[PDB]
Amino acid sequence: TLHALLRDIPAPDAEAMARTQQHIDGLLKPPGSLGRLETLAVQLAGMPGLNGTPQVGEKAVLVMCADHGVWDEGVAVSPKIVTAIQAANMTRGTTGVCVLAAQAGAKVHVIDVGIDAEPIPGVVNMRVARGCGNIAVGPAMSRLQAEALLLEVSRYTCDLAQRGVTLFGVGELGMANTTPAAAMVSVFTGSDAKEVVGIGANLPPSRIDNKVDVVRRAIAINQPNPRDGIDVLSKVGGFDLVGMTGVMLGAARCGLPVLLDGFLSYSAALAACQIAPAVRPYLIPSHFSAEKGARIALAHLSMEPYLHMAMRLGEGSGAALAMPIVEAACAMFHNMGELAASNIVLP
Amino acid sequence: TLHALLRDIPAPDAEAMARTQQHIDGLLKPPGSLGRLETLAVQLAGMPGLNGTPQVGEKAVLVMCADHGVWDEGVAVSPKIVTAIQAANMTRGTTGVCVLAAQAGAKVHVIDVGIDAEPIPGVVNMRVARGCGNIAVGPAMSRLQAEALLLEVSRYTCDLAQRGVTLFGVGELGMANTTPAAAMVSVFTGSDAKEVVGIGANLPPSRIDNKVDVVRRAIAINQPNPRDGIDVLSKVGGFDLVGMTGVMLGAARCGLPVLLDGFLSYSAALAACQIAPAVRPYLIPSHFSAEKGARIALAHLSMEPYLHMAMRLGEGSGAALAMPIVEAACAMFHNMGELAASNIVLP
Ligand SMILES: Cc1cc2ncn([C@H]3O[C@H](COP(=O)(O)O)[C@@H](O)[C@H]3O)c2cc1C
Numbered sequence: 099t100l101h102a103l104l105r106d107i108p109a110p111d112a113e114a115m116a117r118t119q120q121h122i123d124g125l126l127k128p129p130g131s132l133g134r135l136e137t138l139a140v141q142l143a144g145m146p147g148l149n150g151t152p153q154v155g156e157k158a159v160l161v162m163c164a165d166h167g168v169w170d171e172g173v174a175v176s177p178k179i180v181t182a183i184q185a186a187n188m189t190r191g192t193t194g195v196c197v198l199a200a201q202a203g204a205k206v207h208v209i210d211v212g213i214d215a216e217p218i219p220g221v222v223n224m225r226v227a228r229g230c231g232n233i234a235v236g237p238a239m240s241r242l243q244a245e246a247l248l249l250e251v252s253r254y255t256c257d258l259a260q261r262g263v264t265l266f267g268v269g270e271l272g273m274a275n276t277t278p279a280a281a282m283v284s285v286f287t288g289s290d291a292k293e294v295v296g297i298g299a300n301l302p303p304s305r306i307d308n309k310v311d312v313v314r315r316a317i318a319i320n321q322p323n324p325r326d327g328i329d330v331l332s333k334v335g336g337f338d339l340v341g342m343t344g345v346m347l348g349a350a351r352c353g354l355p356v357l358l359d360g361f362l363s364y365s366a367a368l369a370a371c372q373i374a375p376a377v378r379p380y381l382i383p384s385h386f387s388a389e390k391g392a393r394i395a396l397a398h399l400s401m402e403p404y405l406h407m408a409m410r411l412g413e414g415s416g417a418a419l420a421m422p423i424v425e426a427a428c429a430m431f432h433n434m435g436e437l438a439a440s441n442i443v444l445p
Numbered sequence: 446t447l448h449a450l451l452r453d454i455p456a457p458d459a460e461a462m463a464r465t466q467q468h469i470d471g472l473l474k475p476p477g478s479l480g481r482l483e484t485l486a487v488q489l490a491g492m493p494g495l496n497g498t499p500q501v502g503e504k505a506v507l508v509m510c511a512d513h514g515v516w517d518e519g520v521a522v523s524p525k526i527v528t529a530i531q532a533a534n535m536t537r538g539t540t541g542v543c544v545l546a547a548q549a550g551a552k553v554h555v556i557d558v559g560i561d562a563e564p565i566p567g568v569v570n571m572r573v574a575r576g577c578g579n580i581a582v583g584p585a586m587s588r589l590q591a592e593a594l595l596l597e598v599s600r601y602t603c604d605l606a607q608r609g610v611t612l613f614g615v616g617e618l619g620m621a622n623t624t625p626a627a628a629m630v631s632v633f634t635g636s637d638a639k640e641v642v643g644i645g646a647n648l649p650p651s652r653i654d655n656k657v658d659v660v661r662r663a664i665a666i667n668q669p670n671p672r673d674g675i676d677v678l679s680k681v682g683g684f685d686l687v688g689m690t691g692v693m694l695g696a697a698r699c700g701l702p703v704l705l706d707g708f709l710s711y712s713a714a715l716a717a718c719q720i721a722p723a724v725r726p727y728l729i730p731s732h733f734s735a736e737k738g739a740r741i742a743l744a745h746l747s748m749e750p751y752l753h754m755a756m757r758l759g760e761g762s763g764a765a766l767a768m769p770i771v772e773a774a775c776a777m778f779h780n781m782g783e784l785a786a787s788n789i790v791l792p
């Protein structure tokens with residue numbers, strides 16, 4: 099039951115956070131001098147799945163892949179098959195997230211939640227259908243299909259926790275997916291489409307007008323309820339967006355941290371927090387996406403990314419890049435010396 | 446001869462940069478989607494010491510330690526001995542830079558260029574004197590002493606290059622050093638002291654006025670020539686600042702990259718670029734320091750850091766934290782697959 103799932107998400111452990119802060123203040127450095135690295139360590143200490151201390155065991159990046167009917171509206175320059183081809187490359191370790199994950203010592207899990215092609219060997223099969231419906235003329239899927247995918251992905255995610263995974267990263271792969279992502283952001287934040295529609299995978303500037311038009315039509319035609327995150331996902335979202343939201347709900351239920359990626363992921367996080375506000379404390383930003391609507395989405399999530407790389411690739415590449423930062427906060431916490439031990443006293 | 450040194454700094458290799466850009470454009474991703482990670486890889490390809498390709502061999506962080514006479518003016522809350530104590534801890538691996546360097550697989554070299562205490566076993570000895578002169582009433586040192594230290598540090602730095610080191614990080618340790626750092630930044634940028642004097646190691650807000658006053662006096666009394674970087678360093682700088690500038694000149698001469706740290710390092714980089722503009726292409730920013738004058742210093746260096754961590758510890762801790770990013774750009778370059786190989790064609 100999805101209701102049980104959402105009900106059982108743990109609140110953060112304030113007691114462990116207090117012990118953590120005290121320990122950090124006593125380290126060999128002026129109090130608060132390591133800034134965000136200190137607040138990150140405290141955040142981690144409060145997550146129940148981490149056993150009262152900032153720590154990182156195995157790391158995994160979950161890449162949700164799916165095609166979208168809205169591609170027919172001419173909102174993407176990349177051929178539709180690129181989704182299936184790149185998904186295949188994910189199993190070969192040659193994509194951007196694969197290379198960055200390897201560099202961070204993380205494993206990449208490629209999940210097909212709705213690719214419009216024959217099944218790809220090596221890819222986790224959780225496909226709902228061959229691509230979702232064209233949001234410009236109707237809903238992407240039924241509410242039942244959205245809830246079912248959320249549940250299955252949430253379970254798969256927390257199941258990995260039993261394999262030693264303590265840190266997740268979310269990612270996606272799907273031609274035309276920056277369109278539903280913009281639709282969702284517009285609805286959740288109440289911002290106009292023009293302010294949130296970006297160039298995605300190098301869409302020519304002369305084709306942007308059409309993209310904005312399609313986004314408005316999707317909203318006018320479906321009339322999604324902004325107060326109902328699942329309604330929004332099933333109407334103007336996509337299977338990949340749903341999957342990403344599911345990883346966030348699964349990690350939160352598991353009491354573990356999840357690193358966001360770029361714009362697509364911010365869209366999924368807005369949905370996840372709308373569905374269950376208790377998910378918020380488990381989300382960790384990675385980078386500040388070069389996508390046009392990134393600033394608005396992040397402001398509504400009250401998040402300030404650590405990395406400013408002007409990145410806009412997607413795939414969970416930003417999440418993988420930030421993993422070393424999470425490990426750095428843990429190393430600081432566990433390995434630094436203490437002031438008292440050196441007889442150093444500071445006001 | 447310092448003149449020879451500055452004369453022999455190599456210009457970047459445009460031919461290798463062109464080959465690099467072509468290769469990056471052909472990788473499995475929409476052109477330019479990895480943003481700053483792509484420009485970083487190209488920057489590295491142009492550095493002659495890297496052999497025409499983005500690569501990272503051994504990594505080292507050089508921490509310059511020294512005391513300052515200006516401490517007597519009440520501009521620092523930390524006792525003067527903390528410099529010597531922390532320098533000792535650097536050899537034990539318990540400080541913040543030590544923990545972060547280990548995490549990045551880098552070695553920390555602790556160099557005493559002017560600590561006001563007995564020599565510390567395990568620390569590289571290059572001390573000019575026991576602390577520099579109080580800049581509030583005169584110069585920190587003679588021009589001869591500044592040039593000599595620049596030379597020695599520059600040589601030590603490029604000598605490490607022969608040991609397999611291809612990536613450097615600069616750092617410092619010295620109670621009261623945010624004062625000369627502010628004086629230098631004010632002089633090089635023409636900004637008022639009030640706009641560049643920060644709280645350093647948690648200086649109380651009620652003591653800031655005095656700090657600004659001391660900085661103005663240092664400048665009025667010494668009258669350093671902003672067009673002469675060495676004049677500025679020897680008059681209102683410190684031994685640690687000089688050492689940091691020396692690492693930058695040494696790495697540039699060696700045709701290798703150097704990662705900056707925080708405010709202290711920005712001050713040393715302004716000097717280094719004033720002395721030899723050819724040093725600029727070898728400098729790589731790490732993070733955006735929480736120090737008040739950071740924004741102004743960075744704007745004058747035309748640099749945009751990758752990490753926003755609100756860090757203000759110093760020691761080269763920011764430089765160590767960014768090393769994984771440099772390695773990430775190299776991994777992307779060498780390990781990603783190619784579009785043509787997957788028959789993917791994009792406008
Ligand atoms: C070769 C290639 C690799 C990619 N890896 C991620 N994306 C990104 O591009 C898509 C969204 O952009 P849009 O809405 O404009 O279609 C997603 O697949 C996203 O992951 C890629 C796109 C391409 C072409």
Ligand SMILES: Cc1cc2ncn([C@H]3O[C@H](COP(=O)(O)O)[C@@H](O)[C@H]3O)c2cc1C
Nearest residue numbers: 521523617618619620621622623645646759
């Ligand atoms: C325990 C301790 C460890 C440090 N590590 C770096 N700094 C930083 O503080 C000093 C500059 O700040 P100010 O100008 O206010 O004195 C430098 O040593 C700098 O590296 C430290 C300072 C302290 C107290």
